[PDB]
Each structure stands twice: as structure tokens, then as C-alpha cells.
Amino acid sequence: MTEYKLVVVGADGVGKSALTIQLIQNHKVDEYDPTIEDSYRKQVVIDGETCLLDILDTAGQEEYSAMRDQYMRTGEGFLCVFAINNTKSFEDIHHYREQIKRVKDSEDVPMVLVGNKCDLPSRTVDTKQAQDLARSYGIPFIETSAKTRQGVDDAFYTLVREIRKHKE
Ligand SMILES: Nc1nc2c(ncn2[C@@H]2O[C@H](COP(=O)(O)OP(=O)(O)O)[C@@H](O)[C@H]2O)c(=O)[nH]1
Ligand SMILES: [Mg+2]
């Protein structure tokens, strides 16, 4: 079965793990397991054909992570996540995008900008500012809530579409 490797990056605390687990848990009966894995698989249908997503969550750059760059280089597409009530995590998006280009040795890498925690009323990053940043990068932008499930499936599906566009 075809397998696409998706890597989730961004500052710690923005909801990288919550988004990933919410995607995996949606639409299925999951074993109760309190383990937090750093990677999860999910079956999807791409152009009528069942495929596997392998989704890996990475540590924010404020944490040392010996394998982080090697892990990222295996990624075919990246979810760059910030929290809408965390201005620094949005400012950090530039770092993550440049670090993705570094580890992939490429100027053209599939990515999606994700503004998470959109259930919160304490936003400090205007939706327009993130929309305009994504457009300037040529990438999609979506606001999500791992809490309410708003946009969660759609964020990962949009990334899969970006990967497919790149492959073609
Ligand atoms: N309100 C709200 N809290 C969230 C959301 N996503 C994550 N959180 C919380 O933010 C904290 C960090 O989430 P986590 O997924 O562990 O962050 P990570 O370090 O980016 O993986 C936890 O307390 C989560 O429950 C969201 O969409 N809304
Ligand atoms: Mg955390």
C-alpha cells in the first residue's frame, strides 16, 4: 500500500500532538491506550485508491532533538502549526519553513500553514495576517481546533493535496 510521510512541525505547545491524535481517532474505534506515540498511521483514499499516511510529530526548536532534522528529511509534506493565541509561535513559522527547505535541500516543499486553537477567544494573530503570509509563500492556510475537531481532517487532506500537486 502506498504510504505518504507527513511531518508536523512548530513550537511546542501549539497542538501538534492533539491535532495528530484527533485525526487518527476520528471515524474509528480505537483501542484505549494512554501511550503518546510520536508517529501514527491513518488510511485514506487518494484518487479512488486506499493509501497510508504516516504522520510524525516533531519537537519545537526550543528543544534539542538529535534526530529531528533526519526525521524531517523523510517527510514528503509538512504541517507548520502555530497557535492563534501565541504570537511567538506564528513568528517562528519563518524558521520552520526555512528549516524544512534546508533539510529537504529544496526550495519547493509541500507545506500547509495551520493556525490551531481556533476555539479560543484570546487570539493575538489576525486570521488575515496568517492568510496573507501563506499566500506570500504560495501555500494553503487553515485554522483548526483539535478541541472541537474544526478543520482537523481538512488540514491533513489539504497537505496530501499539496504533496500530490508537487509529485505531478
Ligand atoms: N483550547 C485548545 N487547546 C488545545 C488545542 N490543541 C491543543 N490544545 C492544548 O494545548 C496544549 C498543548 O497541546 P499538545 O498537542 O500537547 O501540544 P504540542 O506540543 O504542540 O504537541 C494541551 O493542553 C492541549 O490540550 C486546541 O485546538 N484548542
Ligand atoms: Mg506539549
Report resolution (Å) to 1 decimal.
Answer: 1.7
Which ligand lies nearest to the CA atom of residue 15 in the structure? 1
CB-based pocket (< 6 A), ligand 1: 12-18, 116-117, 119-120, 145-147
Amino acid at 150: Q
DSSP state of 65: -
Short-list 16, 158, 150, CA closest to 83: 16
Per the entry, the structure determination technique was: X-ray
The Cα 140–Cα 55 span in angstroms is 19
The Cα 1–Cα 95 span in angstroms is 34
Domains of the chain, start order: 3-167 (3.40.50.300)
Ligand 1, residue 120: give the atom nearest the CA. Answer: 1
Q: Whose CA is nearest to atom 14 of ligand 1?
A: 15
Phi-psi region of 44 (alpha: psi -120 to 50; beta: other; left: phi over 0): beta
Instruction: Render 66-86 in DSSP notation, one character per residue.
Output: TTHHHHHHT-SEEEEEEETT-
Tell me the best of 58, 62, 145 to mutate to test the pocket of ligand 1, counting ligand atoms within 8 Å of each CB and taking the most.
145
HSE-up of 6 (CA within 13 Å, CB side)? 30
Short-list 62, 70, 50, 56, CA closest to 11: 62
Torsion angle of C-alpha atoms 98, 68, 146, 62, degrees rounded to 10: -70
Phi-psi region of 117 (alpha: psi -120 to 50; beta: other; left: phi over 0): left
